[model samples]
Target chain A: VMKALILAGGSGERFWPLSTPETPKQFLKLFGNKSLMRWTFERVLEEMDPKDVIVVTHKDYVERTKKELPELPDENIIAEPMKKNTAPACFIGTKLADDDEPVLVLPADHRIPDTKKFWKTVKKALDALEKYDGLFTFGIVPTRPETGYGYIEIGEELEEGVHKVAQFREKPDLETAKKFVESGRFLWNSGMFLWKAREFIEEVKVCEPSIYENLKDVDPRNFEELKKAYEKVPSISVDYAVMEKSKKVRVVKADFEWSDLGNWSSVREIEGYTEESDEVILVDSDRVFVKTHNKPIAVVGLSDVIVIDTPNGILICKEEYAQKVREVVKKLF
Target chain B: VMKALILAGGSGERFWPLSTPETPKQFLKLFGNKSLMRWTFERVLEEMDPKDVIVVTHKDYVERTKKELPELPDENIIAEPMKKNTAPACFIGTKLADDDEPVLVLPADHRIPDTKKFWKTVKKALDALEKYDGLFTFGIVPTRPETGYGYIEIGEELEEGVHKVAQFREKPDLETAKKFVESGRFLWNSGMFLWKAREFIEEVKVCEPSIYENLKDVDPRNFEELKKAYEKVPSISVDYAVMEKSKKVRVVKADFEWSDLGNWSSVREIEGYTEESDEVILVDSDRVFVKTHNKPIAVVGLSDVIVIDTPNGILICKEEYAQKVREVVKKLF
Candidate 1:
């Protein structure tokens, strides 16, 4: 049996102006008519049973998440009162299962263009889970020398396209990233994982006993006690708490196209958007991207720039400095 | 007695978002708390009587102008039904006088920093008007080779600072404008004039007979008759119809700081506004001008740009292309 757990409580500030405290990046209709959360939910529904899917979000976003994915049952929506990062979110998500079922954990703000191939990769991991008692994560094959994402070094090839994890590297400098891409041994840490629920719980108790002990006895049905138990959980990523310390970890080389949509520069790759996209009215300007309301915007003599207009505020920034947009939001408060 | 005639009917489209059809540039408080029209009114009141002041505006702005200048009687606000250029506006402005009073014609959208010096310059022109049986127009000494304004070639010195008009040059190219500034014989045509009402009316009859014929019998008190009379009047500037053709024209070398406030670049000289001014929040930009409402705006990595936000619309353009903003407005409707 396959079940999916969506960690949807991230408050991404990179897409500010368009994304606010009430509606963060996951709830934004960035590339299409549907929100990124809805697309992520649909991606899971393509392979897993609707009755087995669970979405763990902040308590404030429970109603909004349910409204975005109305096909899922109310019980599938688990609301966390506080944010304890991915380790605790994943641990509480495991409580939804009574038996040791293989659970797929995914973030709610990624863009995967090929869901069919994504399901095929997930099925391959489930097949590998039956034969090997280890943890599994997808590793995207690099198409560029991107320095924004973490990289994984592949050790020995254990199967057709699966390999043992040699080591995990943090975001590298430009020169190191170029060398990593040239070596053809490093894959992007895509943050997607599949493992048996009970086995993962046992591995967590061994690798990160503090986190497991803090959440082991909490009643998932009792809202008040569950909220209280979440306070003591350490705010650490699953990779740091378990994956890096465990010897039984492997990576699957992914073939599907993926983008984190990290900032405005990455958003420029959406299908019909470009410097001269019809979405904006331009004059005497080139290499300009405008995201505005119904108001007709005219830009002149500006190149390699991004203009974002929302009801909350307006941001005009250079494309090279787009990653620093979070600093702009921080200055506002 | 010296009476003032404020030609306040200009529909300045260059101000764009901040200046709309319902509220043009003259009605805008671009600098301090008072509107530009109010500032122009106060400048005249510094030297003339308020009861003798007449505000000539378009029919649509009669109530707005009256509300701004409540001290002036309703009869002092002459509303024109249609735009017939400055020649007709100045000709109709003469109807307020049954005697040959010297009328000081002033545009309602200029920024003069030194009002004391401005009044002193006006007194010089009024003295010239009383001594010479001719038309008097103030000429600003050139500070930069600005090619946007018309140039006056000073022919021969008539008095201490006044000179006979040698020629009226249209807006010059860069080369000609540079030569005009360096030659020490040219002054910018500041659209201000002083001449007795009967003398200007009679001169219009002599130099532009067709304009005088069209406006001769219309009663200034009857708006319907005045509107009908303005239809046959040719739309021509006072410089072209009277000052350019008349042989009795004199130019006063003004010593006050005056800016037409013609476009966004000129508006940047309003005291404390700069690229790092408190009116806008900038990150990595320079030489940017911002005019916004209460909304907070953030700009990054841009230079020499203008961002204007108003309830009607928003305009973002390069400082060099400021005059072409009217083309942006034309493209909208």
Candidate 2:
């Protein structure tokens, strides 16, 4: 009784040079020559059939999505007319399923190290959804005072690791984020959810009435209907539209090693390579991340640098300014 | 009559990524889409005829030299079987011309801003070569305490701006370099010379007897003769072989703005672009030189950095460590 809605509609401007409008983040083979889309797609394949896994991406990315998931049926890949953020994609993913069963909603560009531990955590929530038809979100235990992600406050323990979502906090400044990490009641919002597809739509009807009414009868499978609905729908994320306001929300404390792969600096944390490589010729340099396909690189007497040399383009940035890559992409595209 | 010998055989390791073994420094389009080879070729064309000019490059780059100067005769592009430094190349160029006229010997990769002033200075040395059968070298007046170039000491003022060569100083350390600049008697060796081909050959016979006796009869235009000569020739530069040891030598006081284009940092003084551009999106960066072909670059909170993005590869280097690029090319190739 398990299904998955893999959200692949992200533009992924933060991963530019590697990720362009034609080939966005999900298709990037960041880990061991396997793409992020394949990692998330196969993670759910262990528990569900190929037909049960659905991918929601932009109209332009449908062909790319097809190549990523060649096994999944064409109808299961729901196409959005344009990017209206995660709310519309989630709404479209749930409506197309049209079934009264729990469907796991996850992003295609996340990095989950321990796949077995991840499924154990995910299985517990999906099984619990059978008895209680409530919206469930996986929350990561805070490791650092990260200002890049939203915070979820734990209200009351529902059973064992699951608790009622007290509130969804917006991205905070450094001072506010540090306090939240010290409080220990807060967890980073992982943007991963599992709930009955029918129940999720019901919550949207009550919380985000405008989006619910505009796209109620519009099937994501029907391209014409989805285009018409996207024109009238307000652009918003699912967290702000439904999960934050709905009382049916529950938070599961996921202790597995995970990362959003938000920027080049985050990739460094995963690679853990502080030394030098044969390709990278460094002299008195430290804390450098270089990724060029079989090209020789030389970094001399300068530290804390990130170099991304791709056929598409090149980016030379400092470690602290990794998040500013979006600004480069914004000016370019 | 004015003639020229263009030494294009330098394996420019300092200009990595852009200057590979296949297309080294001379062929680089660093100035206005025209190569350094073309700039030097056309610059001499103002004083000498196409038939009077000779190019000596590595065997691999002979075709590239032909494409750069189509007006120059194919017979004029002498092929070096191997790089044995400038002495052998200069010896070959002189032997092939087989004339007693003065041949202006210069590098193909130097940047000269004032073309008219450069030819005016060059003409004086070539004209003086007619009356005095002595080796004439151009020496630039020192503008800074640069440790990269050699110093030429003035012995006696032969003419208005020409002086007899007293001594040739090796590249100095920073302290000694500063002292030389303050002394005002030393001039930076510009590596440009104008002398009678017969006079230079005569100096080689007395100074470098082994090199002169072995290749005295070998014609550079004959492929078999040149290949055999290169095997027996000593691997030495013209400065160390003859100029430093020759008794009959003179230095011209050159006051024109000139640069060897020694490193990327030198290019910044020529470009003088410290502000943001339509292509380079900068936040607080100063003194940054970016050369990416149709690529958007972003620099934040960094100063005195150089970003070179080429189709072949990319290099991100601090301006201070520009000379260390040679060490990078050493390990790579």
The candidate that achieves the highest lDDT relative to the unseen native structure: 2
Which digits, one per residue and each the tens of the lDDT, describe model 1 over residues A207-303? 9988889889887656788878877777898888888888888888886999887887788756434444333545676787788765656675667
Candidate 2 on B1-333: residue-level lDDT in tens? 657899996556677768874457888887989998899888887767899899988888888789989999998888888889899888888876556877889899998878889988987876667766689888999887788786799889877888888998757787687778888889999999888888899999999987898888877788888788778888998999999899988988886888888988778878885556677877557778888665667776577888776655566788888898887776665
Error in Å for residue A317 of model 1: 3.9
**Residue by residue across A1-333, what tens digits does model 2's lDDT show?**
667889987656878778877778888888988999898888877777888888988878888788878999988888788878898889888875656877789999999978888989998887667756789999899888888788899988868888888898978988889999899899999999998888888889999988899898876788888788889998898988888889888988899988899888889888964556667778656888888665666777679888777766667778888888888887776
What TM-score does each prediction get for chain A alone? 0.93, 0.94
- Each candidate's B-chain TM-score, in sequence, is 0.94, 0.93
Candidate 1 clashing pairs, residues 3+ apart or interchain = none
TM-scores for the candidates: 0.78, 0.72
In terms of lDDT, the poorest run of 10 residues in model 1 chain B is B270-279
Query: What C-alpha lDDT do the candidate models reach, one value each?
Result: 0.81, 0.82
CA shift at B168, candidate 2, in angstroms?
Answer: 4.9
Cα lDDT of model 1 by residue, B1-333, tens digit: 878999987766888767777888889887778998899998888867688898888889899888899888899889887887789889888867755688889999888878899988888887877777588888999988998788888987878888888988989989899999999899998999988888888899988997898889787768988877887788898999999899889999998788888887778755435544343667777878876665567787777888887766567788888888877666654
TM-score, second chain, candidate 1: 0.94
Clashing pairs in 2: none
